[PDB]
């Protein structure tokens, strides 16, 4: 649901958080 | 993608460094960061003038900035007004004897970067790229160049499918070193991304 | 390769018998460009072969080479659905290289510990007709005779 890669299932959103 | 930058190709043969000055390992970068920053304000400002080349000389905490343009009067200012207003903000950054001068560009249509900048704005203004391309090649030929090639790459006309358009009349022998080939680039920003204009002018061999 | 025949390199003679062939052979002893060692081994061999056999080393060396030069060799050549071993003449250029190769090669298979001894000995037997290097010449030669049947496929 947030940054880069790999995705978190939300459009264009990976699993990295700030 | 392949072709060598034809100015860097001829440096010290058919063209000469835009910034000439020795400096020692202790100093080089700091001096170059000026030449970068110097070209910063200048290329930012004198753009509307018609900036085409920016020499920088140094000798001893003093720097001599040659500026070759199609509109010398734009930089010189109101009878001396701007050319003043610059040496100030220059010697502010320079922090030193920021000697400035202005050079006439005899024929502008024979200095690549000017043709390039023109096509750039000409497409930023939404003119048919292909036409604008063939015209630029025409004007450089009318100005008696021995050949000319201009190259627009990107979303030409806003087409989703980026594309490379180019026209080339005459000779443009880029493998030839004695060929005096003036190359310059300009970067057209549009509502749909950046295009890139490359211009080649063959002014004749040596 | 494709365009034209290779040109056989010429090799300056060795400075101890003036022989073009001793040079060639010393090269075949040389690992890692260490020719000084290589010459030292060949000459030190000559030291030995002179001792244990009172003949001129060069005489024996050259004689060994003649007795290892294969006159015929098989060379594979797929015709239809089989690779036939074809009996073909050996050019003297190649006879040289094989006998030089096989001498070293068989020599370094011998049991005696010092290299110049192994060269000295393989040279003494190939001159007399014994030795793994001679064997290789014979084995290669029985093959070509065996498959004389396919001499007509020679190119």
């Amino acid at each position: 649901s947030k940054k880069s890669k790999p995705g978190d299932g939300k459009f264009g959103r990976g699993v990295k958080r700030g | 993608g392949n072709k060598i930058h034809p100015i860097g190709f001829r440096l010290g043969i058919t063209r000469d460094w835009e910034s000439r000055w020795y400096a020692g390992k202790k100093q080089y970068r700091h001096l170059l960061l000026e030449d970068q920053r110097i070209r910063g304000l200048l290329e930012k400002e004198l753009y509307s003038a018609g900036l085409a080349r920016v020499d920088i000389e140094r000798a001893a905490d003093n720097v001599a900035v040659t500026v070759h343009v199609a509109k010398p009067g734009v930089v010189i200012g109101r009878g001396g007004e701007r050319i003043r207003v610059l040496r100030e903000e220059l010697a502010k950054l320079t922090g030193k004897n920021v000697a400035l001068n202005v050079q006439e560009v005899q024929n502008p249509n024979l200095s690549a970067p000017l043709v390039a900048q023109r096509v750039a704005e000409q497409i930023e203004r939404r003119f048919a790229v292909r036409r604008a391309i063939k015209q630029a090649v025409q004007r450089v030929m009318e100005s008696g160049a021995k050949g000319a090639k201009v190259i627009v790459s990107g979303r030409i006309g806003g087409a989703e499918q980026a594309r490379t358009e180019w026209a080339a009349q005459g000779r443009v022998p880029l493998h030839t070193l004695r060929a005096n080939i003036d190359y310059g680039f300009a970067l057209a920003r549009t509502t749909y991304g950046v295009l890139g204009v490359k211009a080649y002018i063959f002014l004749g061999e040596v | 390769a494709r365009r034209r025949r290779a040109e056989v390199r010429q090799l300056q003679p060795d400075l101890v018998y003036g022989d073009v062939l001793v040079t060639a052979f010393i090269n075949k002893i040389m690992r890692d460009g260490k020719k000084n060692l290589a010459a030292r081994i060949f000459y030190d061999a000559c030291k030995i072969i002179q001792e244990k056999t009172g003949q001129e080393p060069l005489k024996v060396f050259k004689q060994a080479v003649e007795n290892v030069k294969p006159r015929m060799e098989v060379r594979s050549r797929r015709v239809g659905g089989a690779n036939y071993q074809v009996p073909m003449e050996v050019s003297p250029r190649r006879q040289q290289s094989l006998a030089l190769r096989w001498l070293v090669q068989a020599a370094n298979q011998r049991p005696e510990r010092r290299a110049a001894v192994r060269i000295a000995h393989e040279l003494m037997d190939a001159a007399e007709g014994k030795g793994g290097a001679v064997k290789k010449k014979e084995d290669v030669e029985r093959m070509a005779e065996a498959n004389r049947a396919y001499a007509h496929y020679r190119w």
Partner: protein, 97 residues
Amino acid sequence: IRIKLRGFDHKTLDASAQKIVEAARRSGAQVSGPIPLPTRVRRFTVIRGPFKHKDSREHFELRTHNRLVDIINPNRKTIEQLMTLDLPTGVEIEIKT
């Protein structure tokens, strides 16, 4: 009365060892001709492209050529006419004695 020239351009490094070894050659007396010290090449080797492609580079160098010239018989007639001479931009001068 040494004169030690440095510069990335040799067309100008040789140009100004000339004019130096012509000033004192005029204002008298002797000068030991411009000698070319061995160059000091500082190269840079760069992956020709932005991302990967490790196996392609472009070689850049930076020559700092060196000229040494001597004012043999100093003779302060030189000294003054040298105190105003014309060295182009990319040249640096190390005068000692």
